[PDB]
């Protein structure tokens, strides 16, 4: 790492440790990822197919002056390129025809691909946007269990779901870590971490450990209640291998699971810091702010054997 790039990373607010880590993981691209991450993301939205088709919603918005591009990994997602006036001031948004969320946050639900009639769980700490995406993909059939320790937030979410016309979600005022006490066997599980990790960047080695441990605990509880042949999608908004590839490798070594292929993004890292991981990890994907216009993102699709 040259004194130049180092200084640039230090100025962005990185410690020498993280600067050295990022350079060891991506070399000169490290600076491009760090700088791209300081920029604001476009405003994106998801069409609520529970209330309107994608084709119809698009025609309605275009007619009003809005222009947008498709999010590659989600047929219902689009990111604005022309927002005459606030998209949240439109009748479309106010009547629940669209939902505003980051492009990356659309990937997990779509990858999980819940089907109508299935028993699903969203293990998010703050259920919301992804939970309603699961609901429309399930066409208001099946069941979705979600957990939030914050009653006020849970109340807010229940109102959002009402506006969206979601009828198959059950919200519990508890931590998803207690999912095992329900004595329910799940077809699909969404284990999405809050998009505030190293991938968001506007941390300490300790904070990385805490999240890694919590991630491991959550993943184990999720796999525990998952039916054989069931699917769990794991995702984070962190660039750290410790919260991503390391957790997935641990799962592959610790449980009877296998990874399934995912289409979008770049291959996950199989030699982070010179640590050789299973080639199978390449089934996992990463989104980078320097090429995908999203926060740092990681996603893996796991099938229980």
UniProtKB/TrEMBL annotation:
It comes from the Archaea. The active site is at residue 237. Residues 33-305 form the SAM-dependent MTase RsmB/NOP-type domain. Belongs to the class I-like SAM-binding methyltransferase superfamily. RsmB/NOP family. Disulfide bonds join 44-79, 195-237. S-adenosyl-L-methionine binds at residues 124-130, 148, 192. InterPro entries: Methyltr_RsmF_N (IPR031341), MeTrfase_RsmB-F_NOP2_cat (IPR049560), MeTrfase_RsmB-F_NOP2_dom (IPR001678), Nop2p (IPR011023), RCMT (IPR023267), RsmB/NOL1/NOP2-like_CS (IPR018314), SAM-dependent_MTases_sf (IPR029063). Signal peptide: none annotated. GO terms for molecular function: RNA binding; tRNA (cytidine-5-)-methyltransferase activity. One of its GO terms (biological process) is tRNA methylation. This is 315aa long hypothetical proliferating-cell nucleolar protein p120. It holds the Pfam family Methyltr_RsmF_N. Keywords: Cytoplasm, Methyltransferase, RNA-binding, S-adenosyl-L-methionine, Transferase.
